[PDB]
């Protein structure tokens, strides 16, 4: 259900609920911690905008959709759907499952490369760096429990108007060469 | 004007009393406690309509809430068990209309209760120097920091160039990975990256420190083992630019 897109592309998050309501809300969770309120749609409403946020709702099927237009790296988060029903006094707001959105940039000049970097402390430990690859490249998890490979990671060097992706791989095996770690 | 909860992280043993603080200065009447597992879903455990109102939620835990002042909504766990390991999120709201409703949220406390304290381990930290092959072909230098063998989950990694923290050119894994995925009590690893210009790394007078802040045992938590007590602590590795 997770969702990876290129920045400037669009994103449709869907959501479904059981017992009918009078008010539906969307939130985003930042870095698996704090939630922030995004938009709110009444029971007698079809559509709403809040700049780049576009929300639809139907009480006919009990489902909702949020559209983000012209996406940014800052949109990366996890999106929660949240129904609100109450018998006047209370106001129990419930939360849905959640949908991870990652938004990646466009790499200007890809230069895919894998390097071995050695430990500053006199030891024999080393890591592998797969770096400077374009944003439609797959980093495959290892099919070898002795080999650890991280997920992808975008770093920004603003002073140079430059970005790059990376992933790291290391092992505990003896003589471990980077020459094949990663190989898709 | 925000909504603050303390502490950000907590690891304790079983059978201990926990109080999670939550305060707000916006002056709202309604406050809420939500719990969220590494399952992914949010669940309502407590809410208050105001001072002298406390109410059980959707799913019943063994915890208690108190509301003696509009600002504070503390939450107590009288005895801790591993069953309690989760994230606890505090929220608030208003009762007047005009951009009506929606909750404000704290940042949460991430709590882990451990059965066996001998499972707790601080991280080892190492800094790997940028490849000279990279420098040659790219005129940039990428430092990698690696924190290994820690348990439980709760760390915060940062970079320090010449004594000041930096954010430009840094990337850190969104989440730790499990060193032994099939084990309940598996220890974790985490990597970071810091990219600078080659001329900067090649200045022998620059100084680089990867710092890992670890949340762990408390000063007094019992401990009868030979390794040093895995208390909350900071573990660093450092490296110097190499004139070339």
Domains and CATH numbers, chain B: 1-115 (2.60.40.10), 116-241 (2.60.40.10)
CA of A26: which chain B residue's CA is closest? Answer: B102
Resolution (A): 2.6
The residues with which A76 forms a beta bridge, in sequence order, are none
Tokens found for residue B131:
């490849």
The CATH number assigned to the domain with range A1-105 reads: 2.60.40.10
User: Is residue A45 a contact partner of residue A39, using CB atoms and an 8 Å limit?
Assistant: no
Q: Torsions phi, psi of B220, nearest 5?
A: -100, -20
Select from B127, B168, B189 the Cβ nearest to the Cβ of A158. Answer: B168
Angstrom distance (rounded) from CA B74 to CA B66: 6
Is the domain spanning A106-184 CATH 3.40.50.1980? The answer is: no
Does the CB of A31 have a partner CB in chain B at under 8 Å?
Answer: yes
The residues with which B170 forms a beta bridge, in sequence order, are B194
Tokens found for residue A115:
């390097």
Tokens found for residue A47:
């559509």
Select from A31, A150, A160 the Cβ nearest to the Cβ of B191. Answer: A150
Burial grade of A49 (CB within 10 A; 0-12, 13-18, 19 or more)? exposed
Which H or E run includes B133?
helix B132-138
- Is the Cβ pair B103, A40 closer than 8 Å? no
Task: Give the residue from A129, A146, A149, A166 with the most B CB atoms within 10 Å of its CB, the best one to mutate.
Answer: A129
Does the CB of A91 have a partner CB in chain B at under 8 Å?
Answer: yes
Which of B227, B228, B195, B222 has its CA nearest to residue A157? Answer: B195
Angstrom distance (rounded) from CA B147 to CA B188: 8
Distances from the Cα of A179 to the Cαs of B94, B137, B208, in angstroms?
A: 59, 18, 28
User: Is residue B89 a contact partner of residue B75, using CB atoms and an 8 Å limit?
Assistant: no
Angstrom distance (rounded) from CA A70 to CA B47: 38
Angstrom distance (rounded) from CA B231 to CA B218: 5
Distances from the Cα of B87 to the Cαs of A32, B20, B110, in angstroms?
A: 9, 11, 5
User: Is residue B96 a contact partner of residue B45, using CB atoms and an 8 Å limit?
Assistant: no
Residues of B in contact with A113 (CB under 8 A): 134, 137-138
User: Is residue A55 a contact partner of residue A65, using CB atoms and an 8 Å limit?
Assistant: yes
Task: Give the residue from A168, A170, A179, A181 with the most B CB atoms within 10 Å of its CB, the best one to mutate.
Answer: A168
Angstrom distance (rounded) from CA B112 to CA B80: 10
Residues in chain B: 244
User: Is residue A85 a contact partner of residue A92, using CB atoms and an 8 Å limit?
Assistant: yes
Where helices occur in chain A by DSSP H, the ranges are none
CA of B106: which chain A residue's CA is closest? Answer: A34
User: Is residue A139 a contact partner of residue A102, using CB atoms and an 8 Å limit?
Assistant: no
CA of A154 to nearest chain B CA: how many angstroms apart? 6
User: How are strands ordered across the β-sheet holding B18-24?
Assistant: B3-6, B18-24, B75-77, B64-65
CA of B5: which chain A residue's CA is closest? Answer: A34
Q: Are strands B188-197 and B140-150 parallel, antiparallel or unpaired?
A: antiparallel
Select from B102, B175, B177 the Cβ nearest to the Cβ of A40. Answer: B102
- Is the Cβ pair A34, B105 closer than 8 Å? yes
Angstrom distance (rounded) from CA B188 to CA B152: 8
> What is the SS3 assignment for A54?
strand
Select from B128, B194, B195 the Cβ nearest to the Cβ of A127. Answer: B128
* Residue appearing with tokens 């017992």: A19
CA of A69 to nearest chain B CA: how many angstroms apart? 22
User: Is residue A126 a contact partner of residue A181, using CB atoms and an 8 Å limit?
Assistant: no
């Amino acid at each position: 259900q997770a969702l990876s897109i290129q920045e400037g592309e669009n994103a449709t998050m869907n959501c479904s609920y059981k017992t009918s309501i009078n008010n539906l809300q969307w939130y985003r969770q930042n870095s698996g911690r704090g939630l922030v309120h995004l938009i709110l749609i009444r029971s007698n409403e079809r559509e709403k905008h809040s700049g780049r946020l576009r929300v639809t709702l139907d009480t006919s099927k009990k489902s909702s959709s949020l559209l983000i237009t012209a996406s940014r790296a800052a949109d990366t988060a996890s999106y929660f759907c949240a129904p609100f029903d109450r018998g006047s006094t209370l106001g129990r707001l419930y939360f849905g499952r959640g949908t991870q959105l990652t938004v990646w940039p466009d790499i200007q000049n890809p230069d895919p490369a894998v390097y071995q970097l050695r430990d500053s402390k006199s030891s024999d430990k080393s890591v592998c760096l797969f770096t400077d690859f374009d944003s439609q490249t797959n980093v495959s998890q290892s099919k070898d429990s002795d080999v650890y490979i991280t997920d992808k990671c975008v770093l920004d060097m603003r002073s140079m108007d430059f970005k790059s992706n990376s992933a790291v791989a290391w092992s505990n095996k003896s003589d471990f060469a980077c020459a094949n770690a990663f190989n898709n | 004007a925000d909504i603050y909860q303390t502490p950000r992280y907590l690891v304790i043993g079983t059978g201990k009393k926990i109080t999670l603080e939550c305060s707000q200065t916006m002056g709202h009447d309604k406050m809420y406690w939500y719990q969220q597992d590494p399952g992914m879903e949010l669940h309502l455990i407590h809410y208050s309509y105001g001072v002298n109102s406390t109410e059980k939620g959707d799913l019943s835990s063994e915890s208690t809430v108190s509301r003696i002042r509009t600002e504070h909504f503390p939450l107590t766990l009288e005895s801790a068990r591993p069953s309690h390991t989760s994230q606890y999120l505090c929220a608030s709201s208003e009762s007047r209309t005009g951009i009506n409703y929606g909750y404000t949220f704290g940042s949460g406390t991430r709590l882990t209760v451990v059965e066996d304290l001998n499972k707790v381990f601080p991280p080892e930290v190492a800094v790997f120097e940028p490849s000279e092959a990279e420098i040659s072909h790219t005129q940039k230098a990428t430092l990698v920091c690696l924190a290994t063998g820690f348990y439980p989950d709760h760390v915060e990694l940062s970079w320090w160039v010449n004594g000041k923290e930096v954010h430009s050119g840094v990337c850190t894994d969104p989440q730790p990975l499990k060193e032994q995925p099939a084990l309940n009590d598996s220890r974790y690893a985490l990597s970071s990256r810091l990219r600078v210009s080659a001329t900067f790394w090649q200045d022998p007078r620059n100084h680089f420190r990867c710092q890992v802040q670890f949340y762990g045992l408390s000063e007094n938590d019992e401990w009868t083992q030979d390794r040093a007590k895995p208390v909350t602590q900071i573990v660093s590795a450092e490296a110097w630019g190499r004139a070339d």
